[PDB]
Amino acid sequence: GQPENNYKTTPPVLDSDGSFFLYSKLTVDKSRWQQGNVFSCSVMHEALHNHYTQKSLDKSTGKPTLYNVSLIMS
Amino acid sequence: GGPSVFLFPPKPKDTLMISRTPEVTCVVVDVSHEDPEVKFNWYVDGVEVHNAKTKPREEQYNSTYRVVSVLTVCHQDWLNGKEYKCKVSNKALPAPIEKTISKAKGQPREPQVYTLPPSREEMTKNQVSLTCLVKGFYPSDIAVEWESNGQPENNYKTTPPVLDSDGSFFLYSKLTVDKSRWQQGNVFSCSVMHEALHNHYTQKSLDKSTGKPTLYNVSLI
Amino acid sequence: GGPSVFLFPPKPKDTLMISRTPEVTCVVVDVSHEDPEVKFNWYVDGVEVHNAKTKPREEQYNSTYRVVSVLTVCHQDWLNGKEYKCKVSNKALPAPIEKTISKAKGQPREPQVYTLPPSREEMTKNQVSLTCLVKGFYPSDIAVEWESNGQPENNYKTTPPVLDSDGSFFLYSKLTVDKSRWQQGNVFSCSVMHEALHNHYTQKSLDKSTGKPTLYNVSLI
Amino acid sequence: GQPENNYKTTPPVLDSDGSFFLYSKLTVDKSRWQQGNVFSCSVMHEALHNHYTQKSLDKSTGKPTLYNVSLIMSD
């Protein structure tokens, strides 16, 4: 929930369909990855509902594998 | 005939929504027949601003006229909590009547929103009830919506806020859905908008037997 | 204009309780100081009854005399729907004021009581919320209580019910417990008391392992 | 769903500690029991709170394997 000072935004690139895209890059120290701090990219636009769209980053950001332990049915 | 004045608080969703224009309405009832016209005066921040929305008078069997004065204020002005002043003068009334509206901004607490899995017995009934709990808010002005698949739900019930031991009110949102819709795995989102909320939006997704860990858990039976 | 006489309806808990007989109370407010004693008359279906009583006058903060009179009505009589009349006579009052009340009339339909187990994250917070809802009752005379292994502890939230689309009223009840209490798996009883229920009292039991359907529960959308 | 016509109850039997105990019996059809019908034995006593206690009985016996149907994984 706090702004990040060390972040960069790429200029938009024109597409064949006429839309635009860009990448927002955030750099952090290596030691910060162990704590698993939550990160998000916030974009302001009129098309999005209520001008809000947030995506959270966690450790299980890739393919998730279920935990080894399984609860007994009965 | 004993004119009366009533205070109507403004809807928080008008101020919270950027597109929606906030409006503050002061209403006067029991206007006597001999003086249908009511002298209305409006003040915002102690100053005069040139805007007015006076509803036309209507005839009633009780010889009572309802006059509503609507004022337009900005989001920042509404968030300030400054008093809005409505003065009403009538020939029958010996002295003018004064009313003011100003919501109290005290201890802004960020609301907490939770969703619960549907009850087991609910599968037997052909209607399934979905519950959305919200608490942790001091003021009574809360915006709630049911935004399923990006479109608002036709039917939703909101319980009035009630007192609590923690000092922050809590309430519920109830939705009724068909069993066929829930069987296929439909996802419904409970959106909460508050004046003290961050970015004025909180929502989450739910499904059948919601589980925070990525694991298949089953309790005793 | 002098004393005002009202007949407060009996509390819903006493009306439907077999052990606690319902009590009908009649209140006189703004009683003149020069005439503290007021003549009381209680009529049951036009019949005088000798079981009526009145409490001694109690001083109010506003220095206004307040008088209360209580009558013990039969528990079966309230089920039948008898008529009770309170009449108060005062020398200062020019004309006595009589208040008439009657039992609510409607089709008796059995309400449905459901229990919502907490989600997979509700125990992450310090307080775990247990919810029991009751739907489908036309009369407003209903009681909801919480029981925990024979130890009476009720939050008396008594959230006001709101009408549904079909007109069937519904209400919710919430209780707060600790992590250890929820993890223990002790039985928690939501007790509902209404006219339509069998024997006028029923209970619903909720445990940590409240129930798991035989069908597989998906952990992801 | 419907009150049961059948109802059997033995007279109370004195216990060693001085208390009492008894049983209540309900005979029904196999199909009704297999269909997961809701059954309970309401108990009313002077010492009991609210003078009403309900103990509903569920169809499941709590066996470790009762589903006997292969599960489906969806991510």
From Swiss-Prot, chain D:
UniProt superkingdom: Eukaryota
Compartments reported by the entry: Secreted; Cell membrane
Role, per record: Immunoglobulins, also known as antibodies, are membrane-bound or secreted glycoproteins produced by B lymphocytes. In the recognition phase of humoral immunity, the membrane-bound immunoglobulins serve as receptors which, upon binding of a specific antigen, trigger the clonal expansion and differentiation of B lymphocytes into immunoglobulins-secreting plasma cells. Secreted immunoglobulins mediate the effector phase of humoral immunity, which results in the elimination of bound antigens.
Subunit: Immunoglobulins are composed of two identical heavy chains and two identical light chains; disulfide-linked.
Protein's name according to its UniProt entry: Immunoglobulin gamma-1 heavy chain
Span within the parent record: 387 to 443 of 449
